[PDB]
RNA sequence: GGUUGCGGCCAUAUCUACCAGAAAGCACCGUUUCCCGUCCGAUCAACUGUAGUUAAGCUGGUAAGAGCCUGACCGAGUAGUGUAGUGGGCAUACGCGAAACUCAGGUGCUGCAAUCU
RNA sequence: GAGAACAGAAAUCUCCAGUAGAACAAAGGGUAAAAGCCCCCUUGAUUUUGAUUUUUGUGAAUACAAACCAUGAAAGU
């Protein structure tokens, strides 16, 4: 019994680990892209602050 | 990116290529529709390099249909090898398709011009084809405004000027000026014309030529079609990829 | 190999951004007009700034565009002022390049204190045959990657004709 | 969608109302949506449609005009007409039946074989 | 079979990267007296297809790619839900019955006319 | 985003990306060779005859024909 259940659960754990590895690679590069975009956005809104720019009227 | 691609909304294929304008197309094709079938006929003129196209189209959910179609490559049979894309040549093609359609309907009807994407300008070859067709006798609505020689400074028109344009007067006077001023550009731009040694009165007579010829037989003497379907197909499949 | 994939000059735009609007603009007007042969274009201000000392719709610059042999002729007579020595920069990513000159009198035109002195910015756009696909109306498209201009190709063309240097 | 204009609508035809957001003109009738009415007259620009609207406990008759963009042909009577034509054919064949419809009947006797399908016994 | 023109359905067609395209055409491309318009024959207008090019565009294949579409004895007869009971302290009985996700597969199909080794 | 003398985060110029993230009387629908900006011409925001929905009172919007008109080469509006 201990022989049988451990190869079956081991194969299933292999499937689990492949799923997890894949999802984490994808979300990792996604997170890197979003983080660089966030930093770029922060840097541009840093210099836009020097502009007076009442956003309302039309100037 | 993924989100931008997903939220993207593609236009129609015929629009993604710069080929049609549905804004104009609906105003054309849409009928009164109190009258039910009443198919609306439109003459479609198109200019590519080296060749002109003039067709008469009805459109339907099958997608459309071509009852009559002519091109400028037919005019060598009618008496002109040269200048197929010019104003007079498109005028001749329009007269050709008009007499053709009037022959097939047997009357000697009402067709609406399609401009395409070409700009509406005074002295345009689309309006030359218009005048050819109206020549032919199909009643198309139009105004004398956009024919060439329309003095923009007032509401008048000189018929002799567009008569000269029909006969090919601008190309002829440019030939004369470039000839008696130079021969480099002349030999470059008029090699066939130079080998032929054609006149101004000459070329007007040739256009009269071709006019009477299309009035004689507009019945679409078709091409000879050497090397029938399977030859073309197999030779093209030699160079067509496959998965 | 390059039978048609060459790198001709397309056009040069010469621009004069003035601190003030008026007869100074008209004089810069006249300068570019006499340099080109044709009539230039007056550009207004987009919005008010109040630190550069201007306001909306104030006619604060004048510029002109030139195409043809005239463009590269004027380009060479202007680059004589910069004595054929640009920088690693002054070349865009997409394959264009420009510079700026003070004392416009350093190309042919004399002092003439009638009017004064102006500086101007040259910018020069490069291409090959086939740019019409993104400029026409019917049939509009875009150009492939292999045929795209680039800083490297332009810099090589420049270390070639005009026989210049990069200076860093 | 240009196929929403090459659509003949003769007096008598039945159509559903489903107005699309893409045309601000003639957006009709907030609750006339997914409701069916036959066409009484047609002009340019236009089609007539009548609907039996109930108020209290009587069906009164509301006639209306709509742009062609919102209306749509109804497939309500497809099986009705198919069955009518098939009934004509079957009546001709009889003249040479239960052409009426019938609900799902109890399935009849049959035989189930065991050639390669031996029954597989099992448990929870 | 290839291509051009007009279209229908509107990503199975779109995006990204690379490659191939005999012939046909299409396209870049050559010129600016007139019709015309441009700050600027770059666009638009006109002329000859002559000087010349498949480089580009366009067409087609390719990617354990993105997306888009289809299907699943995929999820699952699960969740949820209508009805009954002196059933327990949520199951049972007769019934109805999903979706997301996951997995797999695919990557434009066509109408009219004309034309080509 | 890259790039150009004075000129910098914002003055003017050029190129690339950019399904709308802009504008159309502030988190929303609809609109991209437009329903947006600029340009050309006009002032149909005009009279007569009836029809429909909102609503018995009107008004509002809606389609519908005849005329005078504008517009575009035209379809048509």
Nearest residue of C to residue A58, measured between CA atoms: C47
Which tokens in the block code for residue A56? 């309302």
Which whole-number Å values give the CA distances from B216 to B70, B87, B210, in the listed order? 16, 22, 9
Kindly report the nearest CA distance between residue D8 and chain B, in angstroms: 6
D43–B34: do the CB atoms touch at under 8 Å? Answer: yes
Which tokens in the block code for residue C139? 């049939």
Closest CA to B84 of B73, B69, B100, B98: B73
Covered bases, chain F (protein CB within 7 Å) = 1-17, 19-20, 26, 29-31, 33-35, 51-54, 62-65, 72-77
Which of left, alpha, beta for C156 (phi over 0: left; psi -120 to 50: alpha)? Answer: alpha
Element (H, E) at B48: strand B42-48
Nucleotide with minimal C1' distance from the CA of C66 is: E40
Chains that touch C (3 or more CB pairs under 8 A): A, B
* DSSP one-letter code for B74: G
Collect all residues of chain A within an 8 Å Cβ-Cβ radius of residue C48.
59
Write down which residues 40-99 in C have CB closer than 7 A to strand E.
Answer: 40-41, 63-68
Nucleotide with minimal C1' distance from the CA of B150 is: E35
Contacts of C153 (CB under 8 A, 6+ apart): C7, C95
Resolution in angstrom units: 3.1
Give the three-state DSSP class for C141: coil
Give the three-state DSSP class for B44: strand
Element (H, E) at C125: strand C120-126
Nucleotide with minimal C1' distance from the CA of A51 is: F10
Residue D90 C-beta-side C-alpha neighbours within 13 Å = 10
Q: For chain B, how many residues are written?
A: 243
CA dihedral B124, B129, B134, B136 (to 10 degrees): 150
Closest CA to B198 of B210, B209, B190: B190
Distance from chain centroid for Cα D15: 9
Å separating the CA of residue A16 from the C1' of nucleotide E104: 19
Distance from chain centroid for Cα D76: 1
Exposure letters B9-35 (e unless 16+ CB within 10 A, then b)? eeeeeeeeeeeebeeebeeebbeebee
The answer to whether B112 touches B42, Cβ cutoff 8 Å, is yes
Neighbours of D79 (CB within 10 A): 11
Cα(B90)–Cα(B99) distance, rounded to whole angstroms? 14
Cα(D103)–Cα(D84) distance, rounded to whole angstroms? 18
The answer to whether C115 touches C30, Cβ cutoff 8 Å, is yes
Element (H, E) at D61: strand D58-66
Q: For chain D, how many residues are written?
A: 124
Q: For chain A, how many residues are written?
A: 59
Which tokens in the block code for residue B139? 């009643």
Cα(C18)–Cα(C87) distance, rounded to whole angstroms? 25
Cα(C142)–Cα(B18) distance, rounded to whole angstroms? 12
Q: Do chains C and B touch (3 or more CB pairs under 8 A)?
A: yes
Q: Which of residues 20-79 of B touch C (CB under 8 A)?
A: none
Experimental method: cryo-EM
């Amino acid at each position: 019994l201990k022989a049988l259940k451990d190869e079956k659960e081991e194969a299933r754990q292999a499937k689990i680990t492949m799923l997890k590895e894949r999802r984490e690679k994808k979300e990792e590069n996604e997170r890197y892209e979003r983080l660089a975009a966030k930093m770029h956005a922060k840097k541009v809104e840093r210099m836009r602050r020097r502009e007076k720019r009442n956003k309302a009227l039309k100037e | 990116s993924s989100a931008y691609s997903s939220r993207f909304q593609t236009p129609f294929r015929r629009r993604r290529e710069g080929k049609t304008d549905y804004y104009q197309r609906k105003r054309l094709v849409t009928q009164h529709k109190a009258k039910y079938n009443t198919p609306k006929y439109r003459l479609v003129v198109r200019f590519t390099n080296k060749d002109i196209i003039c067709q008469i189209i009805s459109s339907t959910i099958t997608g459309d249909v071509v009852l009559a179609a002519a091109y400028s490559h037919e005019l060598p049979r009618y008496g002109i090898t040269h200048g197929l894309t010019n104003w007079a040549a498109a005028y001749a093609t329009g007269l050709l398709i008009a007499r053709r359609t009037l022959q097939k309907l047997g009357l000697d009807f009402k067709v609406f011009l399609d401009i395409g994407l070409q700009r509406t300008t005074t002295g345009a070859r689309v309006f030359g084809a218009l005048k050819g067709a109206s020549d032919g006798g199909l009643y198309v609505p139009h105004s004398e405004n956009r024919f060439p020689g329309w003095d923009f400074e007032t509401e008048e028109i000189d018929p002799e000027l567009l008569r000269s344009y029909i006969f090919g007067g601008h190309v002829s006077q440019y030939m004369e000026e470039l000839a008696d001023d130079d021969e480099e550009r002349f030999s470059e731009l008029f090699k066939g014309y130079l080998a032929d040694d054609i006149d101004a009165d000459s070329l007007e007579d040739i256009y009269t030529s071709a006019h009477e010829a299309i009035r004689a037989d507009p019945a679409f003497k078709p091409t000879e079609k050497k090397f029938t379907k399977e030859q073309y197909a197999a030779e093209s499949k030699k160079y067509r990829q496959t998965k | 190999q390059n039978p048609m994939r060459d790198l001709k000059i397309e056009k040069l735009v010469l621009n004069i951004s003035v601190g003030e609007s008026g007869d100074r603009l008209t004089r810069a007007s006249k300068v570019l007009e006499q340099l080109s042969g044709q009539t230039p274009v007056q550009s207004k201000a987009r919005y008010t700034v109040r630190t550069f000392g201007i306001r909306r719709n104030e006619k604060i610059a004048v510029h002109v565009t030139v195409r043809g042999p005239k463009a590269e002729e004027i380009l060479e007579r202007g680059l004589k002022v910069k004595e054929y020595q640009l920088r690693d920069r002054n070349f865009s990513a997409t394959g264009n390049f420009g510079f700026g000159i003070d004392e416009h009198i350093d190309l042919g035109i004399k002092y003439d204190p009638s009017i004064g002195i102006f500086g101007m910015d040259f910018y020069v756009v490069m291409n090959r045959p086939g740019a019409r696909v993104t400029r026409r109306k019917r049939c509009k498209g875009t150009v492939g990657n292999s045929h795209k201009t680039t800083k490297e190709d332009t810099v090589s063309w420049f270390k070639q004709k005009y026989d210049a240097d990069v200076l860093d | 969608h240009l196929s929403t204009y090459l659509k003949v609508y003769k007096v008598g035809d039945i159509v559903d109302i489903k107005a699309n957001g893409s045309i601000q003109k003639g957006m009709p009738h907030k609750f006339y949506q997914g409701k069916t009415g036959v066409v009484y007259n047609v002009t340019k620009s236009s089609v007539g449609v009548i609907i039996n609207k109930m108020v209290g406990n009587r069906y009164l008759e509301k006639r209306l005009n709509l742009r062609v963009e919102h209306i749509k042909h109804s497939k309500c009577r497809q099986e009705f007409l198919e069955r009518v034509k098939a009934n004509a054919a079957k009546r001709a064949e009889a003249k040479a039946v239960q052409l009426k419809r019938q609900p799902a009947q109890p399935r009849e006797s049959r035989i189930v074989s065991t050639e390669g399908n031996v029954p597989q016994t099992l448990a929870p």
